[PDB]
mmCIF file of C-alpha atoms in Angstrom:
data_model
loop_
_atom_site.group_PDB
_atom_site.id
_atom_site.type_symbol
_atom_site.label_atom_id
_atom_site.label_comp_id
_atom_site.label_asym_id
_atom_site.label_seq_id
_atom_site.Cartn_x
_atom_site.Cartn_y
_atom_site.Cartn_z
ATOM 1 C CA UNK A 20 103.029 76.437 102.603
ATOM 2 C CA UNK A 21 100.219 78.722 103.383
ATOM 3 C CA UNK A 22 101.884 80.339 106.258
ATOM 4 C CA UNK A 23 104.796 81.973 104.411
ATOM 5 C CA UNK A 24 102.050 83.312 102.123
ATOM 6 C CA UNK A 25 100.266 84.790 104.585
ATOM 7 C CA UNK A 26 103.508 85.793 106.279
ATOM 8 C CA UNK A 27 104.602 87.754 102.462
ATOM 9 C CA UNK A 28 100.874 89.092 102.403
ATOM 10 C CA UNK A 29 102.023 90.765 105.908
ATOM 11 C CA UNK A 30 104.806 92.383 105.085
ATOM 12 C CA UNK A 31 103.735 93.521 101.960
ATOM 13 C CA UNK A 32 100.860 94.876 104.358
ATOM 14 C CA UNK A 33 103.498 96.410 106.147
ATOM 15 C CA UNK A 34 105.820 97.606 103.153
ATOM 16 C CA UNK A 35 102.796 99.307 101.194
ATOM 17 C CA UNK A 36 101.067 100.908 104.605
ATOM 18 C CA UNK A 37 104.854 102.303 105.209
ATOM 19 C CA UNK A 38 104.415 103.723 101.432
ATOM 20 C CA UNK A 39 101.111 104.998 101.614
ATOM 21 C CA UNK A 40 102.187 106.691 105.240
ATOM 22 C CA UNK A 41 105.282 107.803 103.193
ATOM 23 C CA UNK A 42 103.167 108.997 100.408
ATOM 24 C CA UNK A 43 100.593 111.007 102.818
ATOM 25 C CA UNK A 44 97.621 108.755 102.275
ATOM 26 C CA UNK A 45 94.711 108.962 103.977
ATOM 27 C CA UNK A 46 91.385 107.757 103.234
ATOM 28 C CA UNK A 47 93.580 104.994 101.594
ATOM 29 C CA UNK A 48 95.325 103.889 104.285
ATOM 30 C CA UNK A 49 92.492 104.561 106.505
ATOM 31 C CA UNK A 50 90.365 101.898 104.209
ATOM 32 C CA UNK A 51 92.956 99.380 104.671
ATOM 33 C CA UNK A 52 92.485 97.974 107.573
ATOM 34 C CA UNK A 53 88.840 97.541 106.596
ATOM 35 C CA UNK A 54 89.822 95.785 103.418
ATOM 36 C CA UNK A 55 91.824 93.576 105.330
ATOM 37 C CA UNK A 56 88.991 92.635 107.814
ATOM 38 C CA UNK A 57 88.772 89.027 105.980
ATOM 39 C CA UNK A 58 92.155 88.225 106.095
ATOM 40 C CA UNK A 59 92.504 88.991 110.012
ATOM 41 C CA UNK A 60 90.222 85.965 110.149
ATOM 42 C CA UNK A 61 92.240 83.450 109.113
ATOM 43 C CA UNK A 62 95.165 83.757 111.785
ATOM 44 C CA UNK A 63 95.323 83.824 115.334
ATOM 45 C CA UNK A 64 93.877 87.177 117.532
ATOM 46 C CA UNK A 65 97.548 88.221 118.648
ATOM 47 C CA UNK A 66 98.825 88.834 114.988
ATOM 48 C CA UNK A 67 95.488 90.494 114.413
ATOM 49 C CA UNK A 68 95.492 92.557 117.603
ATOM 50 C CA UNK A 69 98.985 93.571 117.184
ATOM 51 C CA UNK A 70 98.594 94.437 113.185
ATOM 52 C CA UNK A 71 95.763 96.650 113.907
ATOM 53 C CA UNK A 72 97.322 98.564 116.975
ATOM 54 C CA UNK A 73 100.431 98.848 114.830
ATOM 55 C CA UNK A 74 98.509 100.015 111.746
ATOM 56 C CA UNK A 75 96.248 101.704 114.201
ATOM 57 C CA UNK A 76 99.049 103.927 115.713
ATOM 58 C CA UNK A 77 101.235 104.201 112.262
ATOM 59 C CA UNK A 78 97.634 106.326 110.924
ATOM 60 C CA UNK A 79 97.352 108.137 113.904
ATOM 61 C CA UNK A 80 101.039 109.134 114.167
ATOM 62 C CA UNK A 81 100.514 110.749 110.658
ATOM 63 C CA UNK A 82 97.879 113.667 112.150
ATOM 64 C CA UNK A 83 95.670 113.878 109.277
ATOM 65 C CA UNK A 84 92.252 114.342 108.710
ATOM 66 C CA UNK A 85 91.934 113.651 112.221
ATOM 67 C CA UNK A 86 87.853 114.347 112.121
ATOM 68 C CA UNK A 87 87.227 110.956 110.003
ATOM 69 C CA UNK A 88 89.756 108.743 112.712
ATOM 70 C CA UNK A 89 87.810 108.705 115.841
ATOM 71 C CA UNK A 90 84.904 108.038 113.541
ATOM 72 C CA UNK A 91 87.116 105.239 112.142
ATOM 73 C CA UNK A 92 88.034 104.092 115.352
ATOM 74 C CA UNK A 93 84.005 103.922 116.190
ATOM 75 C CA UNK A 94 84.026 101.450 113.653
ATOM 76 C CA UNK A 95 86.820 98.993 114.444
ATOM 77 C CA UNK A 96 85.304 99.009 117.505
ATOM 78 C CA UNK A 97 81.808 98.405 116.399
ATOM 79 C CA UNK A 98 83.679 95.523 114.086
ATOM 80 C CA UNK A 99 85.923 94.168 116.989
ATOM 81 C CA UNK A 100 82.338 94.079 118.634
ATOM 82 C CA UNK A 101 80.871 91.938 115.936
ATOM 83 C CA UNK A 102 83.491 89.659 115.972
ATOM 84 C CA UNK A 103 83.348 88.858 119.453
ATOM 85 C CA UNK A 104 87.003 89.965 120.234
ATOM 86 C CA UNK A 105 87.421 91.874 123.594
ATOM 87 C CA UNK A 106 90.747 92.603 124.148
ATOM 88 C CA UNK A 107 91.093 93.957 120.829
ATOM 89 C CA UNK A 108 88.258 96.263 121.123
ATOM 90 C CA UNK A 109 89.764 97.411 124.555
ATOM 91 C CA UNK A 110 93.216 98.453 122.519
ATOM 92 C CA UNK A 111 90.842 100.496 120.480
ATOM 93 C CA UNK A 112 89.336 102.068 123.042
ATOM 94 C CA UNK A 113 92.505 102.408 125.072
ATOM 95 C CA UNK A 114 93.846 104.366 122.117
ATOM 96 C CA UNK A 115 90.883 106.233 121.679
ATOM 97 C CA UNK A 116 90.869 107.397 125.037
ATOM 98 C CA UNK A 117 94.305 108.603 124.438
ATOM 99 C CA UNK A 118 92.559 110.469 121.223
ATOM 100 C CA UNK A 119 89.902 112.374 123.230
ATOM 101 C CA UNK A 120 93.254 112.987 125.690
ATOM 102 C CA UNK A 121 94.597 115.098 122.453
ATOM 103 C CA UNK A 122 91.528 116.138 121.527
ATOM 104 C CA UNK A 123 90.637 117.599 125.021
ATOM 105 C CA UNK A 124 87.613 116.312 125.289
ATOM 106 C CA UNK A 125 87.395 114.869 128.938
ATOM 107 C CA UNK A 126 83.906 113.815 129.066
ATOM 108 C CA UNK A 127 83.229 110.447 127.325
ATOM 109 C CA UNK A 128 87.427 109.809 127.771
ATOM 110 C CA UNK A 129 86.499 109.934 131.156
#
């Protein structure tokens, strides 16, 4: 059916984010989870949620370029914004927080 598909198409998000990550991709990588913006769509918020934290912390894990992720960050939360989902755009901010915490900048963290 359609669910295995999408269930491949997942792992195969998983398997060539691990080789980008491997490879010491950036902008790539960083691109990829707005390429797959349209495919979030058609499952449920949890999968979503969950495959952009783990994407999410898998980029940030990598430290580098670290000037075009909070910028990047800005943006899935302007997205997570435009799609109306909350508690997704509060993981994004909850890891951006923790960001500005290594970036030691305690104003807007606070």
């Amino acid at each position: 059916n359609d669910e295995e598909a999408v269930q491949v198409k997942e792992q195969s998000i998983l398997e060539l984010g691990s080789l980008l990550a491997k490879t010491g991709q950036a902008a790539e990588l960083g691109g990829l989870l707005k390429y797959v913006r349209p495919f979030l769509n058609s499952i449920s918020k949890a999968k979503a949620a969950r495959l952009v934290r783990s994407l999410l912390d898998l980029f940030l894990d990598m430290e580098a370029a670290t000037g075009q992720e909070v910028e990047l960050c800005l943006e899935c939360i302007e997205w997570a914004k435009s799609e109306k989902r909350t508690f997704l755009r509060q993981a994004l901010e909850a890891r951006l927080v923790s960001l500005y915490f290594d970036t030691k900048r305690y104003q807007e963290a606070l």
